[PDB]
Amino acid sequence: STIEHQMHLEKLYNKNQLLPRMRQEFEENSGIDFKAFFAHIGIDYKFGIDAMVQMALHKRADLPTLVGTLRHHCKSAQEVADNLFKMASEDCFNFDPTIDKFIVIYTISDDVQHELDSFQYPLPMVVRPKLLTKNYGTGYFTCNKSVILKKNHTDDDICLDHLNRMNKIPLSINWDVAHMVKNEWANLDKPKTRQEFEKRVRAFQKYDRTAHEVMGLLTQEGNKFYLTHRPDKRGRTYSQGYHVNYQGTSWNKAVLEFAEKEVID
Amino acid sequence: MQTFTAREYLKIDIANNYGLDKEDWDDRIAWFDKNENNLLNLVREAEEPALFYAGVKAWMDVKEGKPIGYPVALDATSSGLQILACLTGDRRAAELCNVVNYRDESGKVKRRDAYTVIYNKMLNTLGKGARIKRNDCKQAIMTALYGSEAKPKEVFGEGIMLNVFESTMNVEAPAVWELNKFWLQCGNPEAFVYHWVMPDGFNVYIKVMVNEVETVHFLDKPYDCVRKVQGTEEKTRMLSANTTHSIDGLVVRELVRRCDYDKNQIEYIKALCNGEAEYKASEKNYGKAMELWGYYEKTGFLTARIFDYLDSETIKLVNTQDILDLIESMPKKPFHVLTVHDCFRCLPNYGNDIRRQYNNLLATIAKGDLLSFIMSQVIGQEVTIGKLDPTLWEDVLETEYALS
DNA sequence: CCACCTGCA
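^ inputs. structure came back:
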């Protein structure tokens, strides 16, 4: 039953991988026939879908940023920028020379954006994470990517014992704190720069859109769960997840506690 | 090292999040005692409202005798400087960052804030209107200690102010500063990757990634398109940061091994060491048992990870008294620890244990030869760096605010 | 100086 719930959570995560899920909105779910249209204007199908996706993500983007995400499609950086001119002139999106950015036209629905915001990042597990015995797999039952963060794979010893020890700490949500944050953090967050602060305000609003829904779904079979842990190439250890994580933001840390409570004395 | 009750660690944690984390322990508990009956109204002015609130609710639950799952936080005061002070045996650097006790004229052990100490020393000597902001100085200090040259050139210029900054660092932490100097000259211009193994067997690989800039025209205006590519470089500025961060990585792994241990495993290793274990052996254990024991011999850092590989045959290659000594130095009851690289969280009734374990690890690094062991792998040949005060580790065992 | 994957007008 929790085993089933865990399989449900991983199924949601696998269905909401950011880039593959966005592509669907421009392929099998668009009224627009981008296949036909990209053929018409002579732009490679996979390139065009990818450019549309990147613009629906970024909303606004300078030229070096946009060619960077797409560079692997062409043998030359120049070919990428040309393709981007061809698409901006055919109204796939706009380029405004006075601000030197591309501006999106076609964006994904709010309903799909809400699913991506809920499930594109790893969640805690509601069963004990799989014991790691090789440098592939991060604790879930359906992922087998390299355990090391970014493109830094080795099959040498990276102290799996540490990950296995952290992964089995049972955790839970303190709903008393979680409700205090939702009710009171926005009027408690006093200006801590002035562009960095207005940035931390947005980061909370995005979080507040989906955290309680995720926390409620997460703990459907009980208020007890486990974070998966990954090393970077140096051997710093990172717990994985956005909505529930004792690393990261102060409004995030506060809500987590040990599932095995103790009488202090 | 003075100890505290579990309820007192709750008091310190709530004070920290108010927060008075740079105050001594007793000033923090005194502030708490004074405001105990009004805590919930203080939430709107605490530096960390949510964590303060979580702590206050835990304190109330403890008063009512209710069980709690809330973990308190103890932070390394300048992790990097602590590690570099220990590696180099730099007693002066140690006093900046609570690796050893600092006392004022009164003789009270003070909770030192390295960045403040160096900022004051710089105003004191720079004098006469010094145009420097306190927080920009901390940025310059901490990026410099990790090997940055770009950020001090930006906060202090390239003139007399920079000169005073480097002179100050060389009096306040001579060996730490000399070593940072040295790391710069340790790159190999032919290397695509650097590799070293930590004493608990973690393999560090740093791929050398260099900027490739393709220039592009879009509406006859030029745009530079920069992508990270694997390559080589004549100098390299990364070694101090990566080596130091690999060591705080190790301190995290080993602290968690020593705190959150399997009690049944511990008792097996104890029986194994005393010749009382039923015969059990796996040939696959030998390589790893030998490898980790060797790192102990070369470095002084014995990892509790070795318990995983000790059996009837493999115990024969180690000194059983060292294994028993390590186990005897661990907490009498195990506990969970959450870590944010150099922040540590546990139930408050283990506060004393977590600070004892952090102290032991710093003292081990101070006493031993981890730096030579790591530098030798980085540069490709045996080198030895010496301790500037080879007895520093003795004072490290008893230091007060390593975690604060 | 290092990292990490946050956010996407």
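Residues 57-61, 101, 103-104, 121, 149-150, 199, 202-203, 206, 232-234, 236, 238, 242, 248-249 of chain A lie near DNA strand C (CB under 10 Å from a C1'). Chain A has two domains: 17-103, 122-258.
thumbs up if we can close this ticket
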